[PDB]
mmCIF file of C-alpha atoms and ligand atoms in Angstrom:
data_model
loop_
_atom_site.group_PDB
_atom_site.id
_atom_site.type_symbol
_atom_site.label_atom_id
_atom_site.label_comp_id
_atom_site.label_asym_id
_atom_site.label_seq_id
_atom_site.Cartn_x
_atom_site.Cartn_y
_atom_site.Cartn_z
ATOM 1 C CA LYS A 1 -15.950 12.340 -13.394
ATOM 2 C CA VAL A 2 -12.739 10.904 -11.964
ATOM 3 C CA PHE A 3 -12.879 11.509 -8.212
ATOM 4 C CA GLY A 4 -9.897 11.875 -5.988
ATOM 5 C CA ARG A 5 -9.605 9.496 -3.051
ATOM 6 C CA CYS A 6 -10.555 11.961 -0.313
ATOM 7 C CA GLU A 7 -13.046 13.732 -2.580
ATOM 8 C CA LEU A 8 -14.938 10.472 -3.087
ATOM 9 C CA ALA A 9 -14.711 9.672 0.619
ATOM 10 C CA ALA A 10 -16.388 12.986 1.412
ATOM 11 C CA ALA A 11 -19.107 12.494 -1.182
ATOM 12 C CA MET A 12 -19.809 8.976 0.071
ATOM 13 C CA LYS A 13 -20.068 10.251 3.645
ATOM 14 C CA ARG A 14 -22.455 13.035 2.666
ATOM 15 C CA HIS A 15 -24.672 10.438 0.951
ATOM 16 C CA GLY A 16 -24.766 8.283 4.092
ATOM 17 C CA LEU A 17 -22.526 5.395 3.009
ATOM 18 C CA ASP A 18 -20.154 5.737 5.982
ATOM 19 C CA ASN A 19 -20.888 2.763 8.262
ATOM 20 C CA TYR A 20 -23.913 1.773 6.161
ATOM 21 C CA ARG A 21 -24.741 -1.836 7.036
ATOM 22 C CA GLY A 22 -21.646 -1.721 9.242
ATOM 23 C CA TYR A 23 -19.181 -1.098 6.396
ATOM 24 C CA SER A 24 -16.829 1.728 7.272
ATOM 25 C CA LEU A 25 -16.101 4.449 4.742
ATOM 26 C CA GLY A 26 -12.733 2.905 3.866
ATOM 27 C CA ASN A 27 -14.440 -0.236 2.573
ATOM 28 C CA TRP A 28 -16.538 1.793 0.135
ATOM 29 C CA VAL A 29 -13.591 3.876 -1.069
ATOM 30 C CA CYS A 30 -11.474 0.734 -1.514
ATOM 31 C CA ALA A 31 -14.279 -0.952 -3.458
ATOM 32 C CA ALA A 32 -14.649 2.068 -5.747
ATOM 33 C CA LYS A 33 -10.897 2.199 -6.334
ATOM 34 C CA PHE A 34 -10.699 -1.361 -7.598
ATOM 35 C CA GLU A 35 -14.083 -1.446 -9.318
ATOM 36 C CA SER A 36 -13.794 1.782 -11.291
ATOM 37 C CA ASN A 37 -10.528 3.533 -10.408
ATOM 38 C CA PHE A 38 -12.828 6.286 -9.059
ATOM 39 C CA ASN A 39 -14.296 6.954 -12.528
ATOM 40 C CA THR A 40 -18.058 7.484 -12.548
ATOM 41 C CA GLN A 41 -18.187 6.739 -16.295
ATOM 42 C CA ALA A 42 -16.633 3.265 -16.021
ATOM 43 C CA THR A 43 -18.523 0.495 -17.824
ATOM 44 C CA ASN A 44 -17.530 -3.138 -18.278
ATOM 45 C CA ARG A 45 -19.332 -5.897 -20.126
ATOM 46 C CA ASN A 46 -19.701 -9.267 -18.412
ATOM 47 C CA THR A 47 -19.489 -12.643 -20.148
ATOM 48 C CA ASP A 48 -23.215 -13.234 -19.532
ATOM 49 C CA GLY A 49 -24.099 -10.137 -21.569
ATOM 50 C CA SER A 50 -24.860 -7.912 -18.593
ATOM 51 C CA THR A 51 -22.836 -4.740 -17.982
ATOM 52 C CA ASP A 52 -21.433 -3.093 -14.863
ATOM 53 C CA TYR A 53 -21.855 0.665 -14.510
ATOM 54 C CA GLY A 54 -20.276 3.493 -12.569
ATOM 55 C CA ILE A 55 -18.015 4.050 -9.624
ATOM 56 C CA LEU A 56 -19.222 0.853 -7.916
ATOM 57 C CA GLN A 57 -19.726 -1.213 -11.089
ATOM 58 C CA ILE A 58 -23.368 -2.066 -10.468
ATOM 59 C CA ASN A 59 -24.600 -4.857 -12.705
ATOM 60 C CA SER A 60 -27.562 -4.663 -15.100
ATOM 61 C CA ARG A 61 -28.486 -8.317 -14.492
ATOM 62 C CA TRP A 62 -30.244 -7.318 -11.268
ATOM 63 C CA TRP A 63 -30.002 -3.679 -10.371
ATOM 64 C CA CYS A 64 -30.549 -1.291 -13.263
ATOM 65 C CA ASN A 65 -32.085 -1.227 -16.721
ATOM 66 C CA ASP A 66 -29.912 -0.920 -19.814
ATOM 67 C CA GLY A 67 -32.359 -2.415 -22.338
ATOM 68 C CA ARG A 68 -29.933 -5.110 -23.457
ATOM 69 C CA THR A 69 -29.738 -7.622 -20.587
ATOM 70 C CA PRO A 70 -32.440 -10.210 -21.312
ATOM 71 C CA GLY A 71 -34.312 -11.587 -18.333
ATOM 72 C CA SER A 72 -32.635 -9.127 -15.985
ATOM 73 C CA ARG A 73 -34.289 -7.169 -13.204
ATOM 74 C CA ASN A 74 -34.080 -3.452 -12.367
ATOM 75 C CA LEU A 75 -34.229 -3.584 -8.569
ATOM 76 C CA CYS A 76 -32.908 -0.042 -8.133
ATOM 77 C CA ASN A 77 -35.571 1.265 -10.562
ATOM 78 C CA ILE A 78 -33.057 3.321 -12.556
ATOM 79 C CA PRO A 79 -31.568 3.376 -16.024
ATOM 80 C CA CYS A 80 -28.006 2.115 -15.811
ATOM 81 C CA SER A 81 -26.926 5.413 -17.387
ATOM 82 C CA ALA A 82 -27.888 7.163 -14.135
ATOM 83 C CA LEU A 83 -25.031 5.254 -12.505
ATOM 84 C CA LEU A 84 -22.525 7.108 -14.750
ATOM 85 C CA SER A 85 -23.351 10.642 -13.586
ATOM 86 C CA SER A 86 -20.835 12.968 -11.967
ATOM 87 C CA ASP A 87 -23.336 13.061 -9.077
ATOM 88 C CA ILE A 88 -22.985 9.805 -7.136
ATOM 89 C CA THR A 89 -26.464 9.868 -5.563
ATOM 90 C CA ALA A 90 -27.895 7.151 -7.806
ATOM 91 C CA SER A 91 -24.914 4.822 -7.353
ATOM 92 C CA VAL A 92 -24.990 5.300 -3.584
ATOM 93 C CA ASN A 93 -28.717 4.675 -3.282
ATOM 94 C CA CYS A 94 -28.442 1.536 -5.392
ATOM 95 C CA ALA A 95 -25.352 0.315 -3.528
ATOM 96 C CA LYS A 96 -27.314 0.655 -0.296
ATOM 97 C CA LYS A 97 -29.911 -1.748 -1.719
ATOM 98 C CA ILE A 98 -27.229 -4.192 -2.910
ATOM 99 C CA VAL A 99 -25.363 -4.285 0.402
ATOM 100 C CA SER A 100 -28.636 -4.992 2.243
ATOM 101 C CA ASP A 101 -29.307 -7.922 -0.138
ATOM 102 C CA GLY A 102 -27.884 -10.615 2.145
ATOM 103 C CA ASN A 103 -24.204 -11.101 1.280
ATOM 104 C CA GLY A 104 -23.074 -7.626 2.272
ATOM 105 C CA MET A 105 -20.184 -6.207 0.307
ATOM 106 C CA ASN A 106 -19.277 -9.634 -1.086
ATOM 107 C CA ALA A 107 -21.568 -8.615 -3.953
ATOM 108 C CA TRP A 108 -18.551 -6.616 -5.187
ATOM 109 C CA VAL A 109 -15.978 -9.114 -6.447
ATOM 110 C CA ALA A 110 -13.224 -6.493 -6.296
ATOM 111 C CA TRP A 111 -14.083 -5.737 -2.672
ATOM 112 C CA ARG A 112 -14.001 -9.399 -1.697
ATOM 113 C CA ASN A 113 -10.753 -10.081 -3.511
ATOM 114 C CA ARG A 114 -8.894 -6.813 -2.873
ATOM 115 C CA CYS A 115 -10.402 -4.962 0.113
ATOM 116 C CA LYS A 116 -11.974 -7.483 2.480
ATOM 117 C CA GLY A 117 -9.715 -8.094 5.453
ATOM 118 C CA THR A 118 -7.178 -5.430 4.446
ATOM 119 C CA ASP A 119 -6.322 -2.152 6.206
ATOM 120 C CA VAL A 120 -9.220 -0.326 4.572
ATOM 121 C CA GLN A 121 -8.790 2.702 6.866
ATOM 122 C CA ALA A 122 -5.772 3.613 4.728
ATOM 123 C CA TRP A 123 -8.219 4.712 2.003
ATOM 124 C CA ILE A 124 -9.570 7.577 4.133
ATOM 125 C CA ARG A 125 -6.291 8.476 5.837
ATOM 126 C CA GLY A 126 -5.492 12.188 5.778
ATOM 127 C CA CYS A 127 -8.938 13.112 4.434
ATOM 128 C CA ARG A 128 -10.686 16.101 6.021
ATOM 129 C CA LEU A 129 -13.919 14.456 7.146
HETATM 130 CL CL1 CL B 1 -12.426 2.953 7.246
HETATM 131 CL CL1 CL B 2 -32.819 -5.470 -20.318
HETATM 132 CL CL1 CL B 3 -21.740 13.585 -5.701
HETATM 133 CL CL1 CL B 4 -22.402 -7.799 6.443
HETATM 134 NA NA1 NA B 5 -31.538 -5.081 -15.830
#
């Protein structure tokens, strides 16, 4: 599923991401924009052989099981395929674990390089929330 900007903002809010660990909704929408272009089916292979999955590009090295990332963990206790669903519940629940991990949203390279410090409120502007 390719979400619209405000549509994703509303889904993220309903799943409790708004202000989770102090990160306003705009941060999460901005991260999803640059990680996946709002596409739940996005996948990208990393140089180390792991793969990033879904709207927030969660990596199989630590967070989900894809059966082909040797030595990796599955800290969200999910198949990586669950991160590709039109329903964002699995990605949100896993993202909540990641952002509590210690480095906050810096775990998302696209957020650090393209959202951090910017006017992230723009990403929810005009949305009926
Ligand atoms: Cl915001
Ligand atoms: Cl594996
Ligand atoms: Cl959803
Ligand atoms: Cl933080
Ligand atoms: Na894994």
